[PDB]
């Protein structure tokens, strides 16, 4: 029947986002403070 047909173009989709990265900064920031605290305790 129909000859072999070409495929169409692709449309990718990035995952990470600026605001979600601000949220990841919220995640990361507290860790350093907690680290300062634990280092104090050990010292």
């Amino acid at each position: 029947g129909n000859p072999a047909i070409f495929a169409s173009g692709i449309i990718m989709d990035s995952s990470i986002s600026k605001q979600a990265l601000s949220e990841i900064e919220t995640r990361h920031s507290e860790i350093i403070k907690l680290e300062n605290s634990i280092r104090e305790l050990h010292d």
């Binding site: 995952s15 990470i16 979600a20 949220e23 990841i24 995640r27």
Partner: peptide, 22 residues
């Protein structure tokens, strides 16, 4: 207690982190 880090992208990296905290 059910977790410690929100899952924006999941991935193995988010697991060990949490476990360490535990």
């Amino acid at each position: 207690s059910g977790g410690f880090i929100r899952r924006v992208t999941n991935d193995a990296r988010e697991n060990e982190m949490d476990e360490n905290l535990e």
